[PDB]
Amino acid sequence: RKNRRLKQAKEEAQAEIEQYRLQREKEFKAKE
Amino acid sequence: EKKEKQIEQQKKIQMSNLMNQARLKVLRARDDLITDLLNEAKQRLSKVVKDTTRYQ
């Protein structure tokens, strides 16, 4: 399950990163 | 964090600008009062000119 895990966790972390990026960049607008 | 720091700096700059405009307003009021004083002085001088005995 080498390849399965590696290039499924790649897009897994894609989703995770976009998730946290938006959840960090919204309260920015709130206090702004 | 960098962007938030920039906005926390711009709020400082805007507060300083507001205080400065307040200062300049209060100085301009005093200046206008001094000008009114000098105008009243000019008018009283003209009234003195009206009398020829003192004008001589």
| Separation in Å, CA of B24 to nearest CA in chain A | 29
Best residue in B4, B8, B10 for a mutation probing chain A (most A CBs within 10 Å): B4
How many angstroms away from the CA of B25 is the closest CA of chain A? Answer: 29
Contacts of B3 (CB under 8 A, 6+ apart): A28
Experimental method reported for this structure: cryo-EM
CA-nearest residue of chain A to B11? A32
User: What is the torsion angle, in degrees rounded to the nearest 10, for the CA atoms of residue B15, residue B16, residue B21 and residue B24?
Assistant: 150
Cα four-point dihedral sign A22, A25, A27, A32: negative
| Polymer length in residues for chain A | 32
Helices H / strands E in chain B, number of each: 2, 0
Resolution in A: 2.9
Which residue in this structure is represented by tokens 């000019």?
Answer: B42
Q: Using CA coordinates, name the residue in chain A closest to B8.
A: A32
